[PDB]
Amino acid sequence: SILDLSRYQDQRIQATFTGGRQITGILKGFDQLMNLVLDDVEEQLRNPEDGKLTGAIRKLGLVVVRGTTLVLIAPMDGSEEIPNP
Amino acid sequence: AEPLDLVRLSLDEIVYVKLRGDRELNGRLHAYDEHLNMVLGDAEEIVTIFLKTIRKHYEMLFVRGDSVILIAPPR
Amino acid sequence: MLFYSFFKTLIDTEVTVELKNDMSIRGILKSVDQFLNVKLENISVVDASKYPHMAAVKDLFIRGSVVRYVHMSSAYVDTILLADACRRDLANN
Amino acid sequence: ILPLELIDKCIGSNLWVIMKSEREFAGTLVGFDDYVNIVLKDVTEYDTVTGVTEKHSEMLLNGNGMCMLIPGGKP
Amino acid sequence: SSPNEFLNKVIGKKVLIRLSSGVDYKGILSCLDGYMNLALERTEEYVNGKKTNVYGDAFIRGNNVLYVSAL
Amino acid sequence: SLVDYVDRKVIVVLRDGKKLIGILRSFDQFANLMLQYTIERIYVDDMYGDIDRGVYIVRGENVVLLGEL
Amino acid sequence: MLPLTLLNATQGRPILVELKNGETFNGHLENCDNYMNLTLREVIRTMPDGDKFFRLPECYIRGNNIKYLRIQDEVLSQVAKQ
RNA sequence: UUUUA
């Protein structure tokens, strides 16, 4: 893979799925198909209509993430919501 | 013995086809393939809109298989 | 390649392509490939005023994946030979 | 930790499946294949927009739309 | 394959097929293939809660199938 | 193939409805497209306005049609 | 010059990626493959409505989520020269 | 993982 996931081992990453779901969790494992094991997962819930984040979260614990539905992966450290650059 | 046999046994018969996007077809099946691409002859389309239906007629109609949901042979 | 061959028999005849985005384009079929991409010439768009960006286009390429339908006038020879060919594929393949 | 080994360790135990759409399933993991199509038994299906739930005795779930598989089931 | 074992044991029995659109089909599972294309006999179609169609035989293209459930 | 359109001005319509007008420079077997000197043309009924956009690589699955101009 | 050949030549340079849902990612292209999977560095993520923005140190984008990419004309010129 | 999801 062009992404060396071992660099994120035991770091919190953000994952976005096709269809809009967004989670964060601590990377505990992965395979060559980009399935992941994340711990301490939180899902950022969205509004039913607008599909935009509401600010609320739900805790999901230890989760297997399917690599087929993953569309975005990014480390949390160094991220931040910013004003219009 | 395999699902496509239902379509095979419908060649030259009037079939009903349910498609994505709230569309239905009734027409004589002249050919199909493993994608469920098909050609229907003397075909009627019913487009449902939300409640209302629009009816259209085609002398000869190629249908791309990726829109197909269901095919029913005639009774 | 049953439907590839079918469409090659329609080259230089008039067809109408209905796209999944609900635009319909009538024109002369000039080309088709294994993916059922098509090229149309001397096109006319149905409800053309709804698609003003098409007004200066005379020739176009359509990706096979965005086609919902291709419809055309019927001919007896076309229909019986196409059914023949489908049955031939079934007996052989 | 290998993701599919965690899933295999969940066989016979509760598994909670979150689809890409507003739909979830929770039940006993019977088994799964190389595409992670999954067989669940004693299942509850959740529409997370309407809140309606349905029960199923045993079912094969298409893995195409699965986003998350959570061993231990749903709280 | 557990998916194949389950399917093999509901062949010839009544099953509920839910499509990704949420449209439901209840029928007798005749056979299937590697694409999850299905053939059903004695098929009832349901939209929301209401029965909208019946088919003596129906072919269902496998890409739309969300699940196959035993009844 | 699209080779007949290379180095010609084309309009590309995308699945999201965008209209791109540029010089087709290359394509591949997915109908991925590479366009140079591209503008995005935004329509409201028969009116439009253009945005300079530069070079695009359009992923083929998003291409509805390509028309010679 | 094929589209993916240009993409490979864009490594190390600024790029704009628009996703199928209209999100955009401005960053430097770190890597790509024949799926059009991408890795970017020093990223600005703009949400579809243009209303919320995020800074990411790096990110990975699966190729089948991409609508299009934009690159500088200067890049195409310099790559054609070499 | 783009033209048969």
Residue numbers in the entry:
A (entry chain G): 24 to 108
B (entry chain C): 8 to 57, 68 to 92
C (entry chain B): 1 to 93
D (entry chain E): 5 to 79
E (entry chain F): 3 to 73
F (entry chain A): 15 to 83
G (entry chain D): 1 to 82
The article reads:
Eukaryotes possess eight highly conserved Lsm (like Sm) proteins that assemble into circular, heteroheptameric complexes, bind RNA, and direct a diverse range of biological processes. The Sm family includes the Sm, Lsm (“Like Sm”), and bacterial Hfq proteins. Here, we elucidate the molecular basis for Lsm-RNA recognition and present four high-resolution structures of Lsm complexes bound to RNAs.
Since deletion of the carboxyl terminus of Lsm1 generally enhances binding affinity, we therefore crystallized the Lsm1Δ56C–7 variant of the Lsm1–7 complex bound to the U-tract RNAs UUUUUA and AUUUUG and determined their structures to resolutions of 1.8 and 2.1 Å, respectively. In the structure of UUUUUA bound to Lsm1Δ56C–7, the first uridine is disordered and not visible in the electron density. The terminal adenosine reaches across Lsm6 to form a hydrogen bond to Asn66 of Lsm5. Furthermore, Lsm5 is the only Lsm protein out of the eight studied here that has a noncanonical nucleobase binding pocket because it is missing the arginine that typically forms a cation-pi stack with uracil. In place of arginine, Lsm5 has an asparagine (Asn66) that forms a hydrogen bond to the terminal adenine. We further tested the effect of 3′-end nucleotide identity on binding and found that tetrauridylate followed by a single adenosine binds more tightly than an RNA with a pentauridylate tract. The trajectory of the RNA in Lsm1Δ56C–7 suggests that the RNA can thread completely through the ring, provided the Lsm1 carboxy-terminal helix is removed or displaced.
